[PDB]
Amino acid sequence: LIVPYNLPLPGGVVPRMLITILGTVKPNANRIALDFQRGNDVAFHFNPRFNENNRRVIVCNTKLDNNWGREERQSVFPFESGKPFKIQVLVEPDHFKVAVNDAHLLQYNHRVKKLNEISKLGISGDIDLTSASYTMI
Ligand SMILES: OC[C@H]1O[C@@H](S[C@@H]2O[C@H](CO)[C@H](O)[C@H](n3cc(-c4cccc(F)c4)nn3)[C@H]2O)[C@H](O)[C@@H](n2cc(-c3cccc(F)c3)nn2)[C@H]1O
Ligand SMILES: [Cl-]
């Protein structure tokens, strides 16, 4: 699975939909990014950064009209350089549920209301990708 990787989401994102991304973080990693896309806009951007002011942080944002909105930041960082990870993204009708390494990490309230229109997920950054699928729960 070649990074940058695109995972098509036919029908779009829909409540009860569970996205599982398995992979490994590369050594001396700087950044990782998941991008739930609605055209040229990014509905949900999940962005672990490993060195921002000598600190590790997860930045979440929405890009509407080539402009990034309000940053949602999480200090809780479950990723490590040269270590495998499991990211699980559950779609609910009120928020995105993000779990990493089988423990809930963050919630991301839907800025884009047209969930049937979010038809693509992009996996990019400093990672070796093992598995990318989705199913209903
Ligand atoms: O919003 C998310 C976007 O962020 C900008 S960096 C952004 O730059 C702005 C410049 O005006 C501000 O500085 C903003 N900022 C910093 C703080 C702060 C700083 C410290 C502490 C603290 F409290 C607060 N508050 N606001 C920065 O986060 C990235 O380029 C962008 N992006 C990344 C990628 C990308 C491409 C390929 C791979 C990949 F992983 C990511 N492709 N687009 C995306 O991640
Ligand atoms: Cl970045």
From Swiss-Prot:
It is found in: Cytoplasm; Nucleus; Secreted. A major expression is found in the colonic epithelium. It is also abundant in the activated macrophages. Expressed in fetal membranes. One of its GO terms (cellular component) is mitochondrial inner membrane. A motif (Nuclear export signal) lies at residues 113-128. The modification Phosphoserine is found at residue 75. Residues 5-135 form the Galectin domain. GO terms for biological process: eosinophil chemotaxis; epithelial cell differentiation; innate immune response; macrophage chemotaxis; monocyte chemotaxis; mononuclear cell migration; mRNA processing; negative regulation of endocytosis. GO terms for molecular function: carbohydrate binding; chemoattractant activity; disaccharide binding; IgE binding; laminin binding; molecular condensate scaffold activity; protein phosphatase binding; protein phosphatase inhibitor activity. Its main location: cytoplasm. A beta-D-galactoside binds at residues 68-74. Galactose-specific lectin which binds IgE. May mediate with the alpha-3, beta-1 integrin the stimulation by CSPG4 of endothelial cells migration. Together with DMBT1, required for terminal differentiation of columnar epithelial cells during early embryogenesis. In the nucleus: acts as a pre-mRNA splicing factor. Involved in acute inflammatory responses including neutrophil activation and adhesion, chemoattraction of monocytes macrophages, opsonization of apoptotic neutrophils, and activation of mast cells. This is Galectin-3. It comes from Homo sapiens. The gene is LGALS3. The chain holds residues 114 to 250 of 250 of the full protein.
